[PDB]
Amino acid sequence: NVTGLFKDCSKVITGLHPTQAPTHLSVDTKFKTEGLCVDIPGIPKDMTYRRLISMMGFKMNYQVNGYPNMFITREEAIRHVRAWIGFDVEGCHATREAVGTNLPLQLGFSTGVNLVAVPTGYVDTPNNTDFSRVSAKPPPGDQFKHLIPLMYKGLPWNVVRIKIVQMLSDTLKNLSDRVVFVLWAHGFQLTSMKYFVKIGPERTCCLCDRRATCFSTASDTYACWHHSIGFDYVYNPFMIDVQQWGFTGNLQSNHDLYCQVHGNAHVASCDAIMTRCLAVHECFVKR
């Protein structure tokens, strides 16, 4: 019937004018009749709203000629084990002016790096969707209250994504021509990738013959891991969801069956480290 993708998380009780509503569902009920919508002169468009739109629920299950896979097979992942980067994200929850979606708070990688982002969301307005800071709270529970100080120590996303590209480039330039993000579950990781990933046809670096791994919005150019200084987007990453390989139970319990040297520090980078670690064991341990 409905999806939560692009759910309106505002607390406004009325709906949208027919000229401003992105969809039939979002039109205010006053305008709906006979399965259609009507224009009502004298009930004009609204010029002041700010409606947080949820980015939870991406579905990357397309087949478009000339565009590569994002999610890859296990066999392809195995071939590209040098490109594996575990990735996990801790989130915070929208509050106050909006409620009902989660924003990336701490992004962690199997390099051991954690980056903290300002709570940021996609806000529909009478004009362009506004990418902006939003009010946020920790997820409910005593075990999350340690996230509270992080909600005041974050970096703006424009800095965060440059740092992600720099980190991946420094890590991978002498290892691989690509990145494979190794995930445990994928929904919130994919939500977080909306903030720092772009996709399209396979491209080549503007400075050499390698495939492009990075994109620059400022210059509209493409670079490989060697030539990406200043670039802000990861371009055509690959990824695989380890949780889908038949496991029951949570990440730590499955990781700990194989490995005793990654004690759980309860932080995104540690989840990312355990995810890549579990993936290596599951794919390569001979049985």
Add this chain to the structure above:
Amino acid sequence: AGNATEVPANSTVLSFCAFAVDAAKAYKDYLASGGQPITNCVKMLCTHTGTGQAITVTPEANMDQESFGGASCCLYCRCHIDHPNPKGFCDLKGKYVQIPTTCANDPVGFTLKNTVCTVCGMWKGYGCSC
């Protein structure tokens, strides 16, 4: 909590275009690879006695057109991504858009692929006689 705006039939196309560097090319290519057009647009009940102009403050479909809410036919509005206009203005949001009935199965693709004549106000190739 919150109020859904979308239906699952649109999840794949909107996700693909929401990540694309070039969203317009991505939608065009998605359709060319057999993807279903974006649905759940704001279709208007109207008289079909309108002027036939492309983009209007009231529905203006004639007998060979359907009228839609403007934002709902705009790929950038539907994906909640940046608009081509550097000032962040949409050509369609806040207006109604007329779509030839033969193309009304894919209003988003129609507006993406076509151009309004600013002189006569009709779609080039679908009304503009300049």
